Amino acid sequence: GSNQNNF
Ligand SMILES: [Zn+2]
């Protein structure tokens, strides 16, 4: 799967 981190 794809992963995204938005701090
Ligand atoms: Zn993955």
Find tokens 């981190």 and name the residue. Answer: 5
CA of 4 to the centre of ligand 1 (A): 11
For residue 3, the CA-to-ligand 1 centroid distance in Å is: 7
Residues 6+ positions from 1 with CB-CB distance below 8 Å? none
Query: Amino acid identity of 5?
Result: N
How deeply is 6 buried, as exposed, middle or buried, from its count of CB atoms within 10 A (0-12, 13-18, 19+)?
A: exposed
Question: What method did the depositors use to determine the structure?
Answer: electron diffraction
CA atoms within 13 A on the CB side of 2: 1
Instruction: State the distance from the centre of ligand 1 to the C-alpha of 6, rounded, in angstroms.
Output: 17
The DSSP letter of residue 3 is -
Residue with tokens 């938005």: 6
DSSP 1-7: -------
List the shell of residues around ion ligand 1, using CB closer than 5 Å: 1
First to last CA, the chain: 20
CA 7 to chain centroid, in Å, comes to 10
Ligand 1 centroid, distance to 5 Cα (angstroms): 14
